Design a protein around this ligand. Sequence first.
Ligand SMILES: Cc1cc2nc3c(=O)[nH]c(=O)nc-3n(C[C@H](O)[C@H](O)[C@H](O)COP(=O)(O)O)c2cc1C
Ligand code: SF4
Ligand code: FES
Lengths: 493, 148
Amino acid sequence: MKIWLPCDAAAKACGAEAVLAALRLEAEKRGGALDIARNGSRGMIWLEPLLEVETPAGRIGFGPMTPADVPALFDALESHPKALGLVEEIPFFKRQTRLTFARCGRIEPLSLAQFAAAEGWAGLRKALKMTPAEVVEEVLASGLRGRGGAGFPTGIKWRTVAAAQADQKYIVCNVDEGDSGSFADRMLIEGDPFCLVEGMAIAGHAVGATRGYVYIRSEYPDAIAVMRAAIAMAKPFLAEAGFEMEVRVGAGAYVCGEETSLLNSLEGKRGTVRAKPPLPALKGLFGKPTVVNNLLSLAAVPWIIAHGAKAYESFGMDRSRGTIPLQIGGNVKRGGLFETGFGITLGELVEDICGGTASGRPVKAVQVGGPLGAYHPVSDYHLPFCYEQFAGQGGLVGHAGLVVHDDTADMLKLARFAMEFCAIESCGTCTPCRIGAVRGVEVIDRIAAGDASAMPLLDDLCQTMKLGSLCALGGFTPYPVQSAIRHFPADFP
Amino acid sequence: TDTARLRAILAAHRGREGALLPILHDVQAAFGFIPEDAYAPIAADLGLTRAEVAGVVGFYHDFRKAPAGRHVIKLCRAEACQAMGMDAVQARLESALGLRLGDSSEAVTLEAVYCLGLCACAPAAMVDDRLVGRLDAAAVAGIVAELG
Ligand SMILES: Cc1cc2nc3c(=O)[nH]c(=O)nc-3n(C[C@H](O)[C@H](O)[C@H](O)COP(=O)(O)O)c2cc1C
Ligand code: SF4
Ligand code: FES
């Protein structure tokens, strides 16, 4: 029988390798077909080592398959302890719209056949027939905006880059998700990699670029190789587009996720954030215009242009339009990924969909965004997921990161970790992060001691950090602190 | 056979755009660190100065300034992995090896990485190019068993 054993890090980490080994062993001991596949992750990590088996009805999924439970197979798939039935029919997978991550976990990632059979290469082969302006207007009609920031319409960005003359423009994908809880990019590039290739090719054909780049971290060693193999395999499919893309590995810096620092690291220099009289769009990589975007933004481009922009605008609230993946990690029963339209309350996402906590305890904190995001408690369960409303209710929603902490968590430790992070992760260009962070890390310890001349001091520090810092690594660092302080005062003496 | 390797590496990355970072990656991958005896040739072949080649090496954490132990253990310290008890894993493991966070040795090197993508699998570690998740207080036993 056909076997689908994930090749993702979320599976390899949980021991998918041992599952493979045990399966092959038992098959050698018990004569059988033994057809193994190496798909990606479906987006449900609480059972990531799921051994989907083919059947006339569909594909029946299994739980977190430990090699000790492998012997249970080849006997009866119905009387198995870890039975899930149709993996597609799980209420955690059913409720997802799942557009961008549609063909992620149900195909071999580096298989061109399965990709093409899945409506792949449609966006690209459809765009080349169109013009550089028609594509841009398509993109703009949908108001996709920005997925790694406050949200800037990518249509306007592409327009600005297009209306700028130079012998050689550029395009960059900023997949450097050093934020915590954010693992969507990793999945999308380790599963369905050709989507990124396609989106970048489309974007390059649109803007007017011929050379392209993709910036991967070093903490994602599997994704790098996957993307390399994808680029090397799709060279033929890239030729038709007039587009040569190369992977560039980061070197261990969270601040290299900023557009300026990113393209500064691409240039061979050290990733110090630049000032912003000129925008990277006007003057970027090697002084030439460059369109720098996130992966999730360059993963919807093909879908947007092919399936119709009017469709992608249907999903979402009044201002925010389209589907977003919500990554759910930390202390939580059913973690993983939930792709859906905006307007959903995190109450539903955290109390109903993903149950509660793994420990079984209640939740005291829910941190949207990375460590640059406020600590939203249970009381904010009546707050739907959209950029405008969250940015209005003293917070931030970026790459849709979402962790969870139970009652056995100390907010002091976390508020200290925030500044510790802002300190260890800092280029050192402007003072409010150089000194501000390493002084706030002391002020928090002082607060822990019991001093009263620290809290107002801390407030002033946070305010000057907000209003003075050059980038958001030291302009949003105050948010965790202030949130942990104003939401959980029973932990801060 | 250092000059040879370095020259080969530099020849492999000849003509690229912003080729300092890749060249440094390859150098580190070859030896294990960026030797001060290789700040000059890189600078020369790229047209830079020793100063810039040193600044780039200093800014980035992935570029070792001195070698690590036979084994390496990276252990996230971010929010999610912290949530599901990374501190306990850290304590257990550093008691097992006897090396605190950041404290290196000739045997091992315990350090932080601050994410691996294994956020759902909150407790996450990287042991010698092998990722591990759901690191309970029992998995550490096997972590150290295969890791002398
Ligand atoms: C400290 C810091 C880290 C960032 N990290 C990322 C990241 O990992 N991924 C990302 O897409 N954008 C990141 N950004 C946002 C970039 O500045 C830029 O907005 C992004 O590359 C464009 O993505 P869009 O297509 O959603 O506009 C980061 C910004 C800052 C200040
Ligand atoms: S806030 Fe910190 S990381 Fe950001 S530009 Fe200033 S010094 Fe650099
Ligand atoms: S936060 Fe440690 S796994 Fe991503």
